[PDB]
Structure 1
């Protein structure tokens, strides 16, 4: 069997033996209806919900409430299984919310009003999101990672009439409202009043707003639906054929703090359903997936909407910090996955741990490795993967090879952006559609030229059907992302192998010139060193005044075990050297010294984004002083 033949053989067994997978094949009549010319965003949703009515649409983990008789506290506790809701039931919930908002006797919502949502991803989140779509309200999915000051700025700029929040974000939400922002109602969702912690947050919100003399109505999503259940059906918002109104703002920061609201019109939002991408809906692939990325990111919206578009089932991860990710994947057994490199890291770290534990005397090492990967593939990852994509950040060549040997299928490298669209580059190939044209521009100061070495290099400029028109209420910032000829400037350096074949290098702003005149690509190198078995996380740092790099390294638990600081450092240094040799790195690409950090980078401490990407500005603010001091200590 060839590698594709192995894959096709696994897939046929699945369609022969697995009733869940068979029952979830997309219906071509539904897909054709969705694809029809003239279909607007809400018409797509309604058509999908009607076409797949009796199928399971969405799942989340079952739960129980537990009272501790010592503390007297009642706490929600997750069970190791998922429960689903049908398309019919989801759309019914959506219709209840839309009715409640449209037919409110005093202050109803109208098309074009902004609605702000503070959460992760969940059935309730999907319900609010689709209800916005139903009424043509503009969704503003706020990043849970944002600081309150940033949230206030966003709300000030968008003037939402409604703010919805999960209990754990009620602290931030109340501060936003006490600051005199525009929302008229605060809707609490993902809410279980039987949990004492959640109930206390909800009561506190209610109390604090009342005490401040706020006229905000605080209410539960369940109560909104109860209202809507006794109101007439709401109209479905369908813009006229010549109009493409705003439907969604996706806030995105880049390097520098400064969140900007990427404008997603009705047509752009619809591509999340019916689009080109591997994981968007223009496909007959069975979509059973685990949604673990927030709805505040485009990859999280695609992972939901692209699956709904194909009549599949979207399961929502229980926690936003990936701490339940593999328990969830093992239960869901998805047919498809969008990896981010941090998840690949976790799979690699599981592999290393299991391989070490099982490499006992008398183990056959020429066999064990295969068995450890088979166990990962079949059990840890569910054993039903038909396809796998990695995106959002670079994955090192060796880690890609590793992941393919575990998955035993291709790991497609998908390059895209909030500004440009998800498709753009797939396995180094320009995707047409949506790309219309592209151009490489020289960046003399970074040493990238059309006349370069084996391949032309430079900044990628593109035109695509999926590019945003600009950022909301930011005329200046908008004008700088487009050149005189209308090309979107990606900020990304690429190498052009042939026409329509491009290799991603790094962000322009990550390209660092060392003092001796060599260029290093800092995020690319971070990815390379992910392949160290001793490294849990790594941040690479350099200064153009220096001839070498430094790093902040979070070691694995096993790396730490039974080692003092000095021996840990030498072990890390030895590993870095091996990894470097394997990846054929130049000596100037190798960190010469580093800080050991035993506290991992997380969303909670501001060092990771909501999709587990290193936040470089926050890492520089956190460690920059210590790192420049290390430079100084080494110089003296």
Structure 2
């Protein structure tokens, strides 16, 4: 038992293991296994380089030793902040075999966060690249050390300068400690904003299950060719199905330099990728490029889009722009992940956010009083299952206000279950606009606006107002020449939109504040408009 970990109920645990949900295998067993059923069947691609499963397997073994000689022991936490590169793999499976626990930080993090990540998780090691996307991470490290003189095992992929050169750790394999299929395998990082993040303990059993399923639902096989276009450490592109899921199904993963259609498209054409995943904001740009940039993306088959609702106005265009099957994906690091099945109608794909991936996923839409709302109603989404946590790392306070007494985790999202179980998300309860004592589902108004020839993307945020409590302020990224706020409102009015849903204010910008994985940060936008307001 890892300090801070909250297990599932004894009786419900057995259920899962007995119901073949928990395989009883580790990531060690996983890699050991696959690496031996198809040896040099390419597993990872970066530029011109290639890494056989078997190769990955080896390096892992070797690195594990080097890591162990470094002094890292079972259960030790090791924050890992690497971009989309081959090392990320050897590095995490090596820790997985050592029993160490990675802590998945994103490359966009900095001292404020990394110090917290290190201080909190009581990390025994920090892993970074010499530099990426123009940001030298050793300077960041130097920053963290300054605050954490104790952090003494800084490791670096590429020119390691004064710290520890990741390349020199590999050494002779050795006997490693028994890792139990039920041990916490790593610690993930909770959603973007509300402030500081929460850590998310996952275990070989609960996670790998979330992989085998996703694979089955996404149809991943040896033919699979996934293009990691988002920071892969993020749950979404790490397991839904993500790079790890891909490994599971003996397929091959292609690491892209950045999310830009500039790095991905040529890469898509060249490596002939068949599935990739974008968040909504990035999805718009991908589209815009998929015309104003002819170049063969025909290889593509499935194009995942999650992290936030993919407004109907845009989803409907996948088939036409990328000539493939769109897949809504509404998941979370806490567990539950919903997928529009590659089967079901075009409509279901274009107007819902899917339905749970596991038969054992339980989801209840309660109302402000934890009173199950009526059928098909809109309400607070709670969930519970095989790959859904029962508590955050060391956080008794948050856990009290996030997990019901019976294990249910409230996801803060507001949704309505449909006929077939499929979930149609409205948005985050805290993203709701309580204007003049009226509920305003932002997304709804946004979706309309995307339909305007001069709108590229849009994020409706609420803003203060002493008389109505809150007013509505929409941010618009012009699809060229910034339309007139009056023109947009008139547009909404013509479409028949309810007066109280029309944005009180329109604010034009070139891009929206985002987060680690790249989602728009409505929190951020809120701050923005609130400052402007104060400016007066």
Of Structure 1 and Structure 2, the greater helix share is in: 1
- Corresponding residue SS for 1:275: helix
Question: Unmatched 5+ residue regions in structure 2?
Answer: 1-19, 132-136, 342-348
> Are the aligned partners of 2:330 and 2:339 in contact in 1 as well (CA < 8 Å)?
yes
Distance 1:611 1:384 in 2: 25
Question: Unmatched 5+ residue regions in structure 1?
Answer: 1-33, 62-81, 194-201, 207-217, 355-374, 560-567, 602-606
Distance 2:488 2:289 in 1: 18
Do residues 300 (structure 1) and 234 (structure 2) align? Answer: no
Which of 549, 566, 588 is matched with 2:500 structurally?
588
1:448-459 matches, within 5 Å, as: 450-451=373-374, 455-459=376-380
Distance 1:50 1:117 in 2: 27
Partner of 2:51: 85
1:255-270 matches, within 5 Å, as: 255-270=193-208
Aligned residues, how many? Answer: 497
Show CA shifts across 1:510-564 (max 9, x none). Answer: 111211x3311234544553444433443322236447522233334x32xxxxx
Distance 1:58 1:424 in 2: 25
1:490-509 matches, within 5 Å, as: 490-498=411-419, 500-509=421-430
1:32-47 matches, within 5 Å, as: 37-47=23-33
Partner of 2:4: none
Deviation at 1:308, TM superposition (A): 1.1
Show CA shifts across 1:567-618 (max 9, x none). Answer: x442x65356547766x643332324323334x33xxxxx211222012222
Which of 258, 272, 275 is matched with 2:213 structurally?
275
Show CA shifts across 1:473-512 (max 9, x none). Answer: 1111112111122211111111133362332111111111
1:398-409 matches, within 5 Å, as: 398-409=313-324
Deviation at 1:335, TM superposition (A): 0.9
Do residues 115 (structure 1) and 78 (structure 2) align? Answer: yes
Change (3 A) 1:422 1:439: closer
> Are the aligned partners of 1:113 and 1:138 in contact in 2 as well (CA < 8 Å)?
yes
1:435-450 matches, within 5 Å, as: 435-443=360-368, 450=373
Partner of 1:574: 487
Partner of 1:154: 117
1:408-423 matches, within 5 Å, as: 408-423=323-338
Change (3 A) 1:526 1:83: farther
Q: TM-score, normalised by structure 1?
A: 0.71
- Corresponding residue SS for 2:168: helix
- Corresponding residue SS for 2:144: helix
> Are the aligned partners of 1:340 and 1:393 in contact in 2 as well (CA < 8 Å)?
yes
- Corresponding residue SS for 2:51: strand
Partner of 1:612: 518
Indicate the larger mover: 533-542 or 319-328.
319-328
> Are the aligned partners of 1:56 and 1:313 in contact in 2 as well (CA < 8 Å)?
yes
Change (3 A) 1:162 1:137: same
Which of 62, 65, 68 is matched with 1:96 structurally?
62
1:306-325 matches, within 5 Å, as: 306-319=245-258, 324-325=263-264
> Are the aligned partners of 1:449 and 1:457 in contact in 2 as well (CA < 8 Å)?
no
> Are the aligned partners of 2:191 and 2:333 in contact in 1 as well (CA < 8 Å)?
no
> Are the aligned partners of 1:188 and 1:221 in contact in 2 as well (CA < 8 Å)?
yes
Partner of 2:226: 289
> Are the aligned partners of 1:510 and 1:523 in contact in 2 as well (CA < 8 Å)?
no
Distance 1:124 1:143 in 2: 15
Do residues 249 (structure 1) and 170 (structure 2) align? Answer: no
> Are the aligned partners of 1:143 and 1:296 in contact in 2 as well (CA < 8 Å)?
yes
Do residues 52 (structure 1) and 18 (structure 2) align? Answer: no
Distance 2:231 2:360 in 1: 26
Distance 1:433 1:404 in 2: 27
> Are the aligned partners of 2:78 and 2:125 in contact in 1 as well (CA < 8 Å)?
yes
Partner of 2:102: 139
Distance 1:101 1:491 in 2: 39
> Are the aligned partners of 1:288 and 1:312 in contact in 2 as well (CA < 8 Å)?
yes
> Are the aligned partners of 1:514 and 1:543 in contact in 2 as well (CA < 8 Å)?
no
Instruction: Kindly report structure 1 stretches of 4+ aligned residues shifted beyond 4 Å.
Output: 34-37, 277-280, 320-323, 351-354, 424-429, 575-582
Deviation at 1:59, TM superposition (A): 0.8
- Which protein has the larger Cα radius of gyration, Structure 1 or Structure 2? 1
> Are the aligned partners of 2:269 and 2:299 in contact in 1 as well (CA < 8 Å)?
no
Which of 92, 107, 111 is matched with 1:129 structurally?
92
Q: TM-score, normalised by structure 2?
A: 0.84
Partner of 1:69: none
